[PDB]
Amino acid sequence: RLTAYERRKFRVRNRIKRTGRLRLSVFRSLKHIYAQIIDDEKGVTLVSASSLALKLKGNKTEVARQVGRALAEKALALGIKQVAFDRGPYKYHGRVKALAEGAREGGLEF
Amino acid sequence: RMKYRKQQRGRLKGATKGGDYVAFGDYGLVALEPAWITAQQIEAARVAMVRHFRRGGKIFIRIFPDKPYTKKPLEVRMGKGKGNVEGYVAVVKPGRVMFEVAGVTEEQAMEALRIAGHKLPIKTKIVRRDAYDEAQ
Amino acid sequence: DVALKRKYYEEVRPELIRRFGYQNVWEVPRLEKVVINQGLGEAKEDARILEKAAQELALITGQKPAVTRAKKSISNFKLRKGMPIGLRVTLRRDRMWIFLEKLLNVALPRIRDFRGLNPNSFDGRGNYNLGLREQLIFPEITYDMVDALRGMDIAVVTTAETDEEARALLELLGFPFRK
Amino acid sequence: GLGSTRNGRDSQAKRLGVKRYEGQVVRAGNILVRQRGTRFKPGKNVGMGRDFTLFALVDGVVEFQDRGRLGRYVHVRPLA
Amino acid sequence: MKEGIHPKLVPARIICGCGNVIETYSTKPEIY
Amino acid sequence: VRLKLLLECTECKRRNYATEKNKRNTPNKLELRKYCPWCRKHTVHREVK
RNA sequence: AAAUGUU
RNA sequence: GAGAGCGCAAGGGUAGAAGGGGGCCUGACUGCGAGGCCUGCAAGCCGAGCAGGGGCGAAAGCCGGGCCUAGUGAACCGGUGGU
RNA sequence: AAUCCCCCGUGCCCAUAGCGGCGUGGAACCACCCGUUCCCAUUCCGAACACGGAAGUGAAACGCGCCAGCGCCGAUGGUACUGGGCGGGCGACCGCCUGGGAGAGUAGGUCGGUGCGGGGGAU
RNA sequence: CGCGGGGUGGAGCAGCCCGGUAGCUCGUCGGGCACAUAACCCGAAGGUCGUCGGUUCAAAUCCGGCCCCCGCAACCA
Incomplete structure (x- = not known):
């Protein structure tokens, strides 16, 4: 009935509880390094992101760093987003990281 | 008359209204008033319908006993643990069909469920088939 | 020998594609893993067989883990819900076509009765169990090396649909039938 | 038993109902549900004690809702 | 893949079988 | 209290x-x-009684 | 120290 | 559709898991407590948040004994360690 | 963008959203897929988790599309039960006046509804 | 219905204070001495501990049912 994507619905859920913080959800497919900043208590998307909207291509992995370096400036362009987090799909390693290290340039407090 | 592998061994009392409509044999004696009915009157009528018939007859019994008795045996001042169960009873509230018949449609068959409903302290009545409703 | 059997498969099956369809090649018949279960259950005594049997199958193929619990505590022998029982090994891609053609071609008539390996009625519906093997007849080793050989198992699995989608496959590969 | 009556053993009972029904402005610390097992999951601004007792966490109005398949939730919504 | 514990199988296919014509399996009894 | 004990731990200094x-x-x-x-x-304390 | 035997 | 399991009895509950397996460790701790449910008194029970000093985590965060309801008995009179 | 239409992430209604049967997709997106040094990991296995990436393919998985055999909700009309009043019975128990009013069954219902944000098509 | 004790070879009995390991006395069979018996002298066979399940590395031994044997009192049709 549920085919081993149970951890994603269990880990994310345990996060909703503390609704004093806003989330960024990433996707990590191949030409698809996406992220979204969701404000939780009103279900919208507060600001978008990019992997192929902003093109920034090549044949590499450092585009994962590039996307977080875009999210830093695009967060403080509205400036209010001081407090946020980051989940992901499954294991948190290389590809899913550089997004965190790119958001750590703008002072996103994680 | 086995009721084996019981759940609970002592029970309670009180019952007033009842249902369970007409059955579908050829003839069945139908009740009118409520009464407890033991496990021995049933056997008495089961013998007296059979040995009337023709050394052959068939009978469908539709009443079965569950509720146990108590007696507190002979000369006891009251106020202890109510025990010592014994042979034990059923319940028929106004109208459900007892003892439907083999279906040989004669007064040869219609007399036996007069002489069987002549023990069995309820007051009975005799019917036949034109009902034909629907259930599950 | 591995590429030598690779080209045997991949130059007999496109010759033998000519009985079904020709469309959707990546949707016909293919092989999968092989599980081998020792299944002794005789080490309800000391854990001496858990090391001694783990150096001949693990010297033919990959290492031999202790997938060995027993899940329950029936009668027979007070196993003590636990211990070890199973001695499973899994083979996937390379040791796969080491072990398959090594047991098939240049070793197998060291067994007696010589009726291939198949009494032609495996009667699977899904992925088609097989496996007729008593332990330590001809793997590579020297003539006793243990006491009390104990009988092994083999269970190939495929991606076939009817019975003949692996009957025809494993017969055009080899594997002599008929009782 | 043996051949008599061996009963007459019972225990004085706890209360464990619902104390703070719909409406009813409460302040931070009041107990909302005494229960024995989880029959009312917590919502926002409602904590869950050691033996499954819900209690208000900030001030406001107790508001019941449901979810259907998942289950009944309670939560206290801020005052103005 | 654990790289230390599994046994060594670098050249344990490339031989003829450590002597095949004494193993009695190649042309051995399987024919009709 | 057959096998359980009431022990009462003290320090390595005091x-x-x-x-x-x-x-x-x-x-x-x-x-x-x-x-x-x-x-x-x-x-770090130690079992002393 | 240490027994009995007509059927 | 959970009908299995969770140290011991029955009821409530639970796989968006309190259930089974490995990684590191003692919060089975100390000026301490707004506010309540229950109650003839005495008892029992839950508890957000500050300060000291620490474990696990990239961070968010969680921890002042155990999935929960039973394993306990006021004072007086005495014993051993520090102030 | 600021007029419509397919695809890709997230939420809420909460099985009239499901199971089972046959067709239909890759130009763009997506998943199988090719390899195995370091980045990593498998009580054994790159089967999962992770890394570097052309082809070949949409068969398996996934989305739109259809068909009610299985499930899932289900009227109107009645009756049981009863809050409040009065009656008849040796005993189990029944009747009428006035306000409420179920459960099972019957005709039937559907193979979902809906926001927020990105990439393309009609410019 | 009740009060307590017990189920060990053919019969009678130890082993159960506290988990490891089965023995004794009568008694059946076979060979001895003796004109044939009795008595006496050697040797062997005969079970798991009523019956079914739990707890531990291990139950005659600790726990739960099921069924038998020993003694005391009141009564049914």
């Missing part, structure tokens, strides 16, 4: 205890752990 329970049969090896006394250092 005075009185911090009152706990022990089994005496399945462990036997004179336990030791780490705690905060009223001299504010988070030292």
Whole structure:
């Protein structure tokens, strides 16, 4: 009935509880390094992101760093987003990281 | 008359209204008033319908006993643990069909469920088939 | 020998594609893993067989883990819900076509009765169990090396649909039938 | 038993109902549900004690809702 | 893949079988 | 209280205890752990009684 | 120290 | 559709898991407590948040004994360690 | 963008959203897929988790599309039960006046509804 | 219905204070001495501990049912 994507619905859920913080959800497919900043208590998307909207291509992995370096400036362009987090799909390693290290340039407090 | 592998061994009392409509044999004696009915009157009528018939007859019994008795045996001042169960009873509230018949449609068959409903302290009545409703 | 059997498969099956369809090649018949279960259950005594049997199958193929619990505590022998029982090994891609053609071609008539390996009625519906093997007849080793050989198992699995989608496959590969 | 009556053993009972029904402005610390097992999951601004007792966490109005398949939730919504 | 514990199988296919014509399996009894 | 014991652990530097329970049969090896006394250092106490 | 035997 | 399991009895509950397996460790701790449910008194029970000093985590965060309801008995009179 | 239409992430209604049967997709997106040094990991296995990436393919998985055999909700009309009043019975128990009013069954219902944000098509 | 004790070879009995390991006395069979018996002298066979399940590395031994044997009192049709 549920085919081993149970951890994603269990880990994310345990996060909703503390609704004093806003989330960024990433996707990590191949030409698809996406992220979204969701404000939780009103279900919208507060600001978008990019992997192929902003093109920034090549044949590499450092585009994962590039996307977080875009999210830093695009967060403080509205400036209010001081407090946020980051989940992901499954294991948190290389590809899913550089997004965190790119958001750590703008002072996103994680 | 086995009721084996019981759940609970002592029970309670009180019952007033009842249902369970007409059955579908050829003839069945139908009740009118409520009464407890033991496990021995049933056997008495089961013998007296059979040995009337023709050394052959068939009978469908539709009443079965569950509720146990108590007696507190002979000369006891009251106020202890109510025990010592014994042979034990059923319940028929106004109208459900007892003892439907083999279906040989004669007064040869219609007399036996007069002489069987002549023990069995309820007051009975005799019917036949034109009902034909629907259930599950 | 591995590429030598690779080209045997991949130059007999496109010759033998000519009985079904020709469309959707990546949707016909293919092989999968092989599980081998020792299944002794005789080490309800000391854990001496858990090391001694783990150096001949693990010297033919990959290492031999202790997938060995027993899940329950029936009668027979007070196993003590636990211990070890199973001695499973899994083979996937390379040791796969080491072990398959090594047991098939240049070793197998060291067994007696010589009726291939198949009494032609495996009667699977899904992925088609097989496996007729008593332990330590001809793997590579020297003539006793243990006491009390104990009988092994083999269970190939495929991606076939009817019975003949692996009957025809494993017969055009080899594997002599008929009782 | 043996051949008599061996009963007459019972225990004085706890209360464990619902104390703070719909409406009813409460302040931070009041107990909302005494229960024995989880029959009312917590919502926002409602904590869950050691033996499954819900209690208000900030001030406001107790508001019941449901979810259907998942289950009944309670939560206290801020005052103005 | 654990790289230390599994046994060594670098050249344990490339031989003829450590002597095949004494193993009695190649042309051995399987024919009709 | 047949096998359980009321043991009462003291320090590696000083005075009185911090009152706990022990089994005496399945462990036997004179336990030791780490705690905060009223001299504010988070030292390690020892089973002393 | 240490027994009995007509059927 | 959970009908299995969770140290011991029955009821409530639970796989968006309190259930089974490995990684590191003692928060089975100390000026301490707004506010309540229950109650003839005495008892029992839950508890957000500050300060000291610490474990696990990239961070968010969680921890002042155990999935929960039973394993306990006021004072007086005495014993051993510090102030 | 600021007029419509397919695809890709997230939420809420909460099985009239499901199971089972046959067709239909890759130009763009997506998943199988090719390899195995370091980045990593498998009580054994790159089967999962992770890394570097052309082809070949949409068969398996996934989305739109259809068909009610299985499930899932289900009227109107009645009756049981009863809050409040009065009656008849040796005993189990029944009747009428006035306000409420179920459960099972019957005709039937559907193979979902809906926001927020990105990439393309009609410019 | 009740009060307590017990189920060990053919019969009678130890082993159960506290988990490891089965023995004794009568008694059946076979060979001895003796004109044939009795008595006496050697040797062997005969079970798991009523019956079914739980707890531990291990139950005659600790726990739960099921069924038998020993003694005391009141009564049914």
